[PDB]
Amino acid sequence: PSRFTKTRKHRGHVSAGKGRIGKHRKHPGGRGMAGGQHHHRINMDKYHPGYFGKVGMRYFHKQQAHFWKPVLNLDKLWTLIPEDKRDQYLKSASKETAPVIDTLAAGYGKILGKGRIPNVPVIVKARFVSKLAEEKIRAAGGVVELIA
């Protein structure tokens, strides 16, 4: 609101907080990003290194949909199973009754292995998987089924 601003407090003080010597002029120093290499170089070299120049190779007509691949770590693998069914699967760790998890149906592309899963067999279906993620899954008695 206007009644809480410092403009109200500056009423009657001549300079309105802008100073008598320097004053409040229109555009001292240029507009926008002017003088980035001449009189604003120091503020660009620090706080913004890498601004000037080009590095990589171009890519004409890039479609982001080609690079869609959300990642899911093993420490959150069991969150895909609904809570009302997690408890019975944890206590009944056995073959011929391993739960099947469709990571693609949950909106994930690749399975990464970061955390630790319980020693319970599980059938994991995914498009991609890291080397470490598969090893931990098989160490618990599970298997990875590649899908498309």
Partner: protein
């Protein structure tokens, strides 16, 4: 005009932008107009459901191909398999799309089943003009919802052959990369 540690901004306001500002003050008013238009069209047109039946299709692109949605219209082959012609189908409330083709048997079977259920749950009044009064259902889409097909059962047995899935991906990737160079070597010899 550069000072302090701040992000670089890219506000595009160097044209006469104030001449082309659109504020949607009529958001509530347009909703009233749309509801009035739907109400008056439903009363005016027929006891018809105000919308046409749509088929189920697979969304393109690797990002969205895991889901099915509503398409534009049933193919000529789909309507033929249901025992009706394209011209008659349009007059009964079935959308027909002549440029879509069938290559998936599962999608073809699902769309044929939709057409069968639609014909069994509608009454086509005769052209004589008797037209007995019937209750109007305003949404054919709600009557025939689209469901995601099932993919797998909840639980199975662990069938492991000892082959690594990570190894399988690496070999398949490597095979495609060197396919051309290996064929050239065989051709030269």
């Amino acid at each position: 005009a550069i000072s302090k540690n701040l992000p670089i901004l890219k506000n595009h306001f160097r044209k006469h932008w104030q001449e082309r500002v659109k504020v949607h003050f009529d958001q509530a008013g347009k909703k009233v107009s749309r509801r009035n238009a739907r109400a008056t069209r439903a009363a005016k047109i027929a006891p018809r459901p105000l919308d046409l039946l749509r088929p189920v299709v697979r969304a393109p692109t690797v990002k969205y191909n895991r889901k099915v949605r509503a398409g534009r219209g049933f193919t000529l082959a789909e309507v033929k398999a249901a025992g009706l012609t394209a011209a008659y189908a349009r007059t009964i409330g079935i959308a027909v799309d002549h440029r879509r083709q069938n290559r998936n048997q599962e999608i073809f079977d699902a769309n044929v089943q939709r057409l069968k259920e639609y014909q069994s749950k509608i009454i086509v009044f005769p052209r004589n003009g008797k037209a007995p009064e019937a209750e109007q259902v305003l949404s054919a889409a709600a009557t025939f919802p689209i469901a995601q097909p099932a993919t797998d059962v909840e639980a199975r047995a662990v069938q492991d052959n000892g082959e690594s899935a990570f190894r399988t991906l690496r070999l398949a990737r490597s095979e495609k990369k060197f396919r051309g160079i290996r064929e050239k070597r065989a051709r030269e010899k």
